[PDB]
Structure 1
Amino acid sequence: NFLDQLDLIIQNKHMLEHTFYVKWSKGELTKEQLQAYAKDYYLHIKAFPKYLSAIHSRCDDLEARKLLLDNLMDEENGYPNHIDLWKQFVFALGVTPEELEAHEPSEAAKAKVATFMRWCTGDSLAAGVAALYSYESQIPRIAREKIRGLTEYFGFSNPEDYAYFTEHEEADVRHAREEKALIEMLLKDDADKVLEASQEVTQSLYGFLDSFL
């Protein structure tokens, strides 16, 4: 039951039903909105590995830490890592490296990131993972929608320009599954806390997308 409630919260407040992606899917965003979005996502992208180490650092379940480590490796080890790939996507949108490093994250991005961190630094490890799950579980569907739109409306005829999304179509299937497993492995009579994180994260993500309209 609680896993299902969790997934339902997400489905009922999924990012592909936000006006920003409804527009995306009909090709109704300007290049500027696209470049703004990409730049403003960068704070979250850089933070993501910290969301994971934050939970790892509070966790004494050895098997859970291994799984958290597996995710953290996928995000951050090697070259190109997920941050690198995101930077490529931004560059392929015509934003320069300098412009990317100079962008001041919007208040809406700072609030989204702080929402994630608040849960990953809190007393419930399971709720920490649910916060992350509530985002990662959406990315497989979003990534392939984003590819469809980049291709059909924004002229991305070269697949290496959307490598981040090609990566995430697949990678996050794995991460969602292992986060689900982590939630039941770490649960300690805090299923309510898991549910609350999901409500709070999904809303935050809506607050974030609101800011480009």
Structure 2
Amino acid sequence: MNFLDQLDLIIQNKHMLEHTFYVKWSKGELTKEQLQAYAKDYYLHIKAFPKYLSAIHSRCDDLEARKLLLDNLMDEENGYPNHIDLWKQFVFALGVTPEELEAHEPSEAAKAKVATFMRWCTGDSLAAGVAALYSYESQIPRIAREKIRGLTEYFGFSNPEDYAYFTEHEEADVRHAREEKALIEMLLKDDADKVLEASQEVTQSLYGFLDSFL
């Protein structure tokens, strides 16, 4: 049918919450040493996400589009604590030291997840760049919901500042997903095919990243 509806369908069937990792999470059947490996490896992506949005904005001449992209990037980076500071917090309440986090060498699967995002956001299809982000962010409110359930049920999280990252994204990425859907429309330049192509890589590139922990 319509391509946004096809876009949502690729996402529905390659959705993170169905991977074995979050299946292992939904049922507690995960380990601390695993989630510490997950939190550290994710850190490359958290630092990189503001660049994804800068990349698209830098190539955009739709003034109204840039305001919406600047809105997201403000949410991600501006002020204290930003989403990065919020992710560091989470890593630390998992028993990891600041020196262990800073020294960690990003995995091959981690550097790979970032280059797919970065490839599309610097590509030639502005609509496909957004669509790459949308493929990640549209899942995060539901993922972050179950992450909070799994963190406090099984891994002994009592202080809710520890999972403040997932609390903010429970609500933040409902807006980002919705605003990004609009952005795809606004910036479409006959590149529906690239849009769905981007969706394909990101959905998989994430599945590859989550494989690494198992």
Structure-2-length-normalised TM-score? 0.99
Structure 2 CA distance, aligned partners of 1:7 and 1:155? 35
1:23 Cα shift?
A: 0.2
Provide the rounded CA distance (Å) in 1 between the counterparts of 2:153 and 2:11: 27
Separation of aligned partners in 2, 1:57 and 1:3: 24
Supply the RMSD in Å over aligned alpha carbons. Answer: 0.4
The offset of 1:70, in angstroms, is 0.2
Looking at structure 2, the residues matched to 102 and 45 of structure 1 have their Cα atoms a distance apart, in angstroms, of: 16
Deviation readout 1:74-125 (Å, 9 max, x if unpaired): 0000100000000000000000111000000000000000000000000000
Paired with 1:16 and 1:198, the residues of 2 have a C-alpha distance of 16
d(CA) in 2 for partners of 1:11, 1:104: 32
Gaps of 5+ in 2: none
Deviating runs (4+, > 3 A) in structure 1?
A: none
Q: Matched residues in 1 for 2:86 and 2:103: separation?
A: 19
State the Cα distance separating 1:158 from its structure 2 match: 1.2
Counterparts of 1:158 and 1:11, CA distance in 2: 33
Aligned counterparts of 1:173 and 1:103: Cα–Cα separation in 2: 31
* Counterpart residue number, 2:115: 114
| Cα separation, 1, equivalents of 2:125 and 2:14 | 23
For 1:207 and 1:120, the matched residues in 2 are separated by: 19
What's the offset of the Cα at 1:157? 1.3
**In 2, Cα distance between equivalents of 1:64 and 1:120:** 14
Identity of aligned residues (%): 100
Give secondary structure in 2 for the equivalent of 1:29.
coil
SS in 2 for 1:160: coil
Shift of 1:65: 0.3
Gapped regions of structure 1 (runs ≥ 5):
none
| SS of structure 2 residue aligned to 1:161 | coil
Alpha-carbon distance in 1 for matches of 2:103, 2:146 = 29
**In 2, Cα distance between the equivalents of 1:166 and 1:20?**
20
Q: Quote the residue 2:187 is aligned against.
A: 186
Is 1:171 aligned to residue 172 of structure 2? Answer: yes
Residue correspondences, number: 213
